[PDB]
Amino acid sequence: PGAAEFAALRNRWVDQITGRNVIQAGDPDFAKAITALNNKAADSLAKLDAAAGRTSVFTDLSLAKDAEMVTTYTRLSQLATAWATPTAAVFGDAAVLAAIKAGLADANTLCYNDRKEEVGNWWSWEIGVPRALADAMVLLHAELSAAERTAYCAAIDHFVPDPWLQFPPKRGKITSVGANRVDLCQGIIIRSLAGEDPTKLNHAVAGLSQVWQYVTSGDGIFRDGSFIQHSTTPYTGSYGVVLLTGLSKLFSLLGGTAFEVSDPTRSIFFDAVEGSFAPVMINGAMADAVRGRSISREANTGYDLGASAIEAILLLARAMDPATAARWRGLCAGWIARDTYRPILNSASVPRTALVKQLEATGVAPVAEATGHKLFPAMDRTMHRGPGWALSLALSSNRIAWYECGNGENNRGYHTGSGMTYFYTSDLGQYDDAFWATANYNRLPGITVDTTPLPDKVEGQWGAAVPADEWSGATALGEVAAVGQHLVGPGRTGLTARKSWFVSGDVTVCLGADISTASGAKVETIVDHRNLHQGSNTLTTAAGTIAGTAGTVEVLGDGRWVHLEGFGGYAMLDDSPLHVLRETRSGSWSGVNINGSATVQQRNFATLYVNHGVGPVAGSYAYMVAPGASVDLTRKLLEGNKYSVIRNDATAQSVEFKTAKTTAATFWKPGMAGDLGASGPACVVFSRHGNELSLAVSEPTQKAAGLTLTLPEGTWSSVLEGAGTLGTDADGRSTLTLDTTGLSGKTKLIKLKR
Ligand SMILES: CC(=O)N[C@@H]1[C@@H](O[C@@H]2O[C@H](C(=O)O)[C@@H](O[C@@H]3O[C@H](CO)[C@H](OS(=O)(=O)O)[C@H](O[C@@H]4OC(C(=O)O)=C[C@H](O)[C@H]4O)[C@H]3NC(C)=O)[C@H](O)[C@H]2O)[C@@H](OS(=O)(=O)O)[C@@H](CO)O[C@H]1O
Ligand code: NA
């Protein structure tokens, strides 16, 4: 491939990142995209350093601070983008062009050149600048000289001599993985178009192949659909999206060319659209539990990341077979149509606007999110859906860290892995509307928590420490899931708790047992901590209302249920006191992120909790949540033994769903919960239909070679579906012995016949 092939590739990249070939004349959404492009460009030009002998390019960005060096270059690439976009205010403006070129020249002289040693964050030198400088070279190819290309290519190659590796020489270079491998290869591929270097381009394309190979440990995509980055943090929602965005752009750029991605194993990446990304997308937002430290970012939210995932999926769909293309488009049309809270076209780029308009022009109908359970045992995450709600559980374990903090971000997030219950609903802004600026980080919804104050960055940055717990895991059969977590508290308090969740098509039953701590402080379990925005949403009870006055906590009477206007119902399944607090909380994003604005946000919350007191001995809880339930339905939850607690202690936790005729259990020790037994740790769901017993089983430690169940509902003599060996115990009960060697927490489905 020669000069013409390289020119064609550069032109395609410019088409992709500007949308210049696809602007629809007089379209109001295109006009808004150009306006947003114009305002950003105008803002940057206003900040140009015009001083003779300047030592920065922008008066508000120091080249001695590596993050401000990156922003220098992204502003320059944004300006080049505007200069190349028909109808933009600066389109083809020679004075603006001259200022971009002078900015690239001086940033190179002053700072980013092939003699400079890295200082500060490696990512700035190897990913932040190269992607932006490469884009600027390609955008400005007709305008930069050969000597300018030589200088800038040399700078990039100095920092990134091989995109299969990362870190400066003084650190020891390691294999780049996952999102980092995609980003380093993107910067080198685009730089290879500017410099017409087929050898670097081929090597960078070949480097993409690693990122979609299945892994069983470390970083990458697991066969169950989990995606981990930084070894111990569930990360589909932020690093997974960086990977998805970069591969969508690169696949589209190279398709049909001499450099096309041709590795057939990229099918694993395509399978991940539904296998990994779709289940953790909720009405257009990536779930908070899979986006790690980005929850602390005011302007990199679940909806910003979901909108990037939608753009990428739409871009990939163009190359797919017809049925897959239509399925992915349907998924996207649904995540777009249902999101009235941060509509995807508000502040969308011109390319994103074009993909959204192209989708609308297909007339492909919106696909609803399927009810039911999606389990990700490799990353200790589960998703559950019913009409009007999605529950995301956030666990941690000897495989998965309590939280990631780093770079001044999410240093307060140390309870976010303590069994959080995120109930996403039609309140689309629940977790987005300054929730992470104002929420009580010691009373996040669903957690059990030792009230000992912990320092920011407790347990270390980058997910370096994990709880040395017994297990966390899950299984599901049909409409019912069983999820368990042995919580070990962060900050060496000695907090221990056995938390389980049994989740039907409508209600979530939350059991807790064996709670104690060594710190001497009170321990709490949070039934909910729910953002009311500026609302005064009524908490209704059997007697009337509760917590009508902000700041004064009240104890629920003996009706045992409370209904929150705009949400649904909560009910206690034991006689423990439920404390209910209406509160107003304030905070700034600067309080949770070094880059956050100083603006103070104020939000109203409803906070419902159980107090286990000081020095609990085998403390416990039992309650349920019924998202979307009316007051009438909430008042009835505890009638008729619909949610029948079987056992809730240090051996096992189990509940029967009367209407679903289905029982769910978690086992901590060998023993029986009702008429089901297990020989060791297990998650089980079972249901009898006449003369047939259906079971789902997982071995949640991921380390046991076998597991034996003592079967409920009488004796069983044949296996109809699945694997396992039937047997009989000393007491005449049927047993099922499973080989669980290497199952990695996955579920086995079995059907038996009497
Ligand atoms: C300083 C150091 O040595 N730390 C490493 C740690 O490296 C840190 O982690 C990541 C990484 O690439 O591995 C890198 O995260 C990315 O940081 C930039 C800014 O630096 C962006 O964050 S933001 O500016 O606050 O938004 C970036 O965000 C994402 O940006 C983009 C995009 O640029 O296209 C898309 C998304 O919308 C957005 O979420 C952020 N990525 C994400 C997904 O958050 C840090 O800069 C880097 O310092 C790890 O290094 S690793 O290579 O081994 O993985 C860590 C692992 O244990 O080791 C530490 O020592
Ligand atoms: Na980590």
Distances from the Cα of 153 to the Cαs of 129, 342, 544, in angstroms?
12, 39, 71
Q: Is the CB of 210 under 6 A from ligand 1?
A: no
Breaks (C-N over 2.5 A) in the chain follow: none
Other CB atoms within 10 Å distance of the CB of residue 405: 25
Helices (H), 273-398: 302-317, 322-337, 350-362
Question: What is the rounded distance in angstroms from the CA atom of residue 248 to the CA atom of residue 332?
Answer: 15
Ligand nearest to the CA of 295: 1
The pick from 159, 407, 436, 595 for probing ligand 1's pocket by mutation, whose C-beta has the most ligand atoms within 8 angstroms, reads: 407
What is the 3-state secondary structure of 637-651? CCCCCCEEEEEECCC
In sequence order, what are the residues at sequence separation of 6 or more whose Cβ sits closer than 8 angstroms to the Cβ of residue 112?
63, 69, 73, 125, 129, 133, 155
Characterise 733 by phi-psi region: left (phi > 0), alpha (psi -120 to 50), beta (else): beta
Residues pairing with 502 in the sheet: 482, 509
Please, are residues 245 and 308 in contact by the beta-carbon 8 Å criterion?
A: yes
Question: What is the rounded distance in angstroms from the CA atom of residue 391 to the CA atom of residue 386?
Answer: 9
Question: What is the rounded distance in angstroms from the CA atom of residue 76 to the CA atom of residue 70?
Answer: 10
First to last CA, the chain: 68
**Strand-pair category, 692-698 with 748-753:** antiparallel
Ligand nearest to the CA of 404: 2
Q: Is 239 a catalytic residue?
A: yes
Please, are residues 388 and 425 in contact by the beta-carbon 8 Å criterion?
A: yes
Phi and psi dihedrals of 523, rounded to 5?
A: -115, 140
Question: What is the rounded distance in angstroms from the CA atom of residue 196 to the CA atom of residue 264?
Answer: 26
Question: What is the rounded distance in angstroms from the CA atom of residue 518 to the CA atom of residue 520?
Answer: 6
Question: What is the rounded distance in angstroms from the CA atom of residue 436 to the CA atom of residue 433?
Answer: 8
Per annotation, catalytic residue among 73, 112, 235, 239: 239
Longest dimension (CA), the chain: 93
Other CB atoms within 10 Å distance of the CB of residue 141: 17
Atom of ligand 1 nearest to the CA of 409: 25
Residue 108, token pair as written in the block:
């190179």
CA-nearest residue for atom 26, ligand 1, is 300
Atom of ligand 1 nearest to the CA of 463: 57
Question: What is the rounded distance in angstroms from the CA atom of residue 677 to the CA atom of residue 675?
Answer: 7
**396-402-407-411 Cα dihedral, nearest 10 degrees:** 140
Other CB atoms within 10 Å distance of the CB of residue 731: 6
Phi and psi dihedrals of 433, rounded to 5?
A: -90, 75
Question: What is the rounded distance in angstroms from the CA atom of residue 160 to the CA atom of residue 26?
Answer: 43
For residue 407, the CA-to-ligand 2 centroid distance in Å is: 13
Instruction: Strand 233-234: give its sheet, edge to edge.
Output: 220-221, 227-229, 233-234
Q: Is the CB of 71 under 6 A from ligand 1?
A: no
Q: Is the CB of 121 under 6 A from ligand 1?
A: yes
Distances from the Cα of 482 to the Cαs of 284, 524, 695, in angstroms?
27, 23, 12
Helices (H), 343-413: 350-362
Question: What is the rounded distance in angstroms from the CA atom of residue 729 to the CA atom of residue 672?
Answer: 14
Question: What is the rounded distance in angstroms from the CA atom of residue 649 to the CA atom of residue 482?
Answer: 15
> What is the per-residue DSSP string for 283-312?
TTEE-GGGSGGGGG-TTS-HHHHHHHHHHH
β strands within 370-507, DSSP E: 372-376, 381-386, 389-394, 420-424, 448-450, 472-477, 480-488, 496-503
Question: What is the rounded distance in angstroms from the CA atom of residue 52 to the CA atom of residue 34?
Answer: 32
Please, are residues 624 and 511 in contact by the beta-carbon 8 Å criterion?
A: no
For residue 228, the CA-to-ligand 2 centroid distance in Å is: 9
Please, are residues 176 and 167 in contact by the beta-carbon 8 Å criterion?
A: no
Burial profile 203-231: b = 16 or more Cβ within 10 angstroms, e = fewer: bbbebbebbbeebeeebbbbebbbbbbbb
Q: Is the CB of 230 under 6 A from ligand 1?
A: yes
Residues pairing with 555 in the sheet: 579
Question: What is the rounded distance in angstroms from the CA atom of residue 471 to the CA atom of residue 377?
Answer: 11
Alpha-carbon 87 to chain mean position: 37
Question: What is the rounded distance in angstroms from the CA atom of residue 437 to the CA atom of residue 706?
Answer: 46
For residue 623, the CA-to-ligand 2 centroid distance in Å is: 33
User: In this structure, which topology does domain 370-640 adopt according to CATH?
Assistant: Beta-galactosidase; Chain A, domain 5 (2.70.98)
User: In this structure, which topology does domain 1-369 adopt according to CATH?
Assistant: Glycosyltransferase (1.50.10)
CA-nearest residue for atom 30, ligand 1, is 242
Instruction: Look at residues 621, 586, 610 and name the one whose alpha carbon lies nearest to residue 440.
Output: 586
The pick from 70, 122, 123, 250 for probing ligand 1's pocket by mutation, whose C-beta has the most ligand atoms within 8 angstroms, reads: 123
Q: Is the dihedral of CA 146, 150, 152, 157 positive or negative?
A: positive
Q: Of all helices (H) and strands (E), which one includes residue 240? A: helix 239-254
In sequence order, what are the residues at sequence separation of 6 or more whose Cβ sits closer than 8 angstroms to the Cβ of residue 363?
none
In sequence order, what are the residues at sequence separation of 6 or more whose Cβ sits closer than 8 angstroms to the Cβ of residue 718?
726, 752, 753
| Resolution in Å, one decimal place | 1.5
Q: Is the CB of 78 under 6 A from ligand 1?
A: no
For residue 127, the CA-to-ligand 1 centroid distance in Å is: 9
Question: What is the rounded distance in angstroms from the CA atom of residue 7 to the CA atom of residue 138?
Answer: 10
Residue 263, token pair as written in the block:
């590795």
Residues pairing with 607 in the sheet: 529, 581
Q: Is 373 a catalytic residue?
A: no
Q: Of all helices (H) and strands (E), which one includes residue 46? A: helix 28-46
Question: What is the rounded distance in angstroms from the CA atom of residue 551 to the CA atom of residue 566?
Answer: 20
Question: What is the rounded distance in angstroms from the CA atom of residue 102 to the CA atom of residue 573?
Answer: 69
Distances from the Cα of 346 to the Cαs of 35, 311, 341, 349, 677, in angstroms?
11, 14, 10, 9, 54
Question: What is the rounded distance in angstroms from the CA atom of residue 637 to the CA atom of residue 657?
Answer: 12
Helices (H), 318-439: 322-337, 350-362, 435-438
For residue 31, the CA-to-ligand 1 centroid distance in Å is: 33
CA angle 636, 638, 639 (to 5 degrees): 65
Atom of ligand 1 nearest to the CA of 464: 57
Instruction: Look at residues 98, 113, 91 and name the one whose alpha carbon lies nearest to residue 50.
Output: 98
Ligand nearest to the CA of 132: 1
Please, are residues 703 and 217 in contact by the beta-carbon 8 Å criterion?
A: no
Question: What is the rounded distance in angstroms from the CA atom of residue 543 to the CA atom of residue 634?
Answer: 14
Give the SS3 label for residue 90: coil
Phi and psi dihedrals of 540, rounded to 5?
A: -90, 140
In sequence order, what are the residues at sequence separation of 6 or more whose Cβ sits closer than 8 angstroms to the Cβ of residue 562?
539, 540, 541, 546, 556, 569, 570, 571, 578, 580, 608, 634
CA-nearest residue for atom 5, ligand 1, is 462
The DSSP symbol for 97 reads H
Alpha-carbon 421 to chain mean position: 14
Please, are residues 153 and 110 in contact by the beta-carbon 8 Å criterion?
A: no
**503-395-473-211 Cα dihedral, nearest 10 degrees:** 120
Distances from the Cα of 560 to the Cαs of 95, 424, 543, 578, in angstroms?
71, 24, 10, 8
Instruction: Look at residues 524, 344, 346 and name the one whose alpha carbon lies nearest to residue 419.
Output: 524
Residues in the chain, total: 754
Phi and psi dihedrals of 299, rounded to 5?
A: -120, 25
Ligand nearest to the CA of 399: 2
Helix axes 178-195, 239-254, angle to 10 degrees: 30
Q: Is the CB of 567 under 6 A from ligand 1?
A: no
CATH 2.70.98.10 domain span(s) along the chain: 370-640
CATH 2.60.220.10 domain span(s) along the chain: 641-754
Question: What is the rounded distance in angstroms from the CA atom of residue 737 to the CA atom of residue 720?
Answer: 15
Give the SS3 label for residue 603: strand
* Sequence letter at residue 575: D
Q: Is the CB of 443 under 6 A from ligand 1?
A: no
Phi and psi dihedrals of 646, rounded to 5?
A: -100, -50
For residue 232, the CA-to-ligand 2 centroid distance in Å is: 5
Residue 267, token pair as written in the block:
């099918």
Question: What is the rounded distance in angstroms from the CA atom of residue 235 to the CA atom of residue 287?
Answer: 10
Q: Is the CB of 18 under 6 A from ligand 1?
A: no
* Sequence letter at residue 153: C
Q: Is the CB of 407 under 6 A from ligand 1?
A: yes
Phi and psi dihedrals of 54, rounded to 5?
A: -65, 150
The DSSP symbol for 58 reads B
Helix axes 178-195, 146-159, angle to 10 degrees: 160
Question: What is the rounded distance in angstroms from the CA atom of residue 8 to the CA atom of residue 260?
Answer: 14
Please, are residues 72 and 103 in contact by the beta-carbon 8 Å criterion?
A: yes
Alpha-carbon 580 to chain mean position: 30
User: In this structure, which topology does domain 641-754 adopt according to CATH?
Assistant: Chondroitinase Ac; Chain A, domain 3 (2.60.220)
Instruction: Look at residues 163, 401, 130, 145 and name the one whose alpha carbon lies nearest to residue 289.
Output: 401
For residue 464, the CA-to-ligand 2 centroid distance in Å is: 5
Number of alpha carbons in the 13 Å side-chain half-sphere of residue 444: 23
CATH 1.50.10.100 domain span(s) along the chain: 1-369
Residue 246, token pair as written in the block:
């970069």
Q: Is 293 a catalytic residue?
A: yes
Give the SS3 label for residue 428: coil
Please, are residues 49 and 103 in contact by the beta-carbon 8 Å criterion?
A: no
* C-alpha gyration radius of the chain: 28
Question: What is the rounded distance in angstroms from the CA atom of residue 153 to the CA atom of residue 147?
Answer: 10
Q: Which residue has the tokens 């239909």?
A: 689
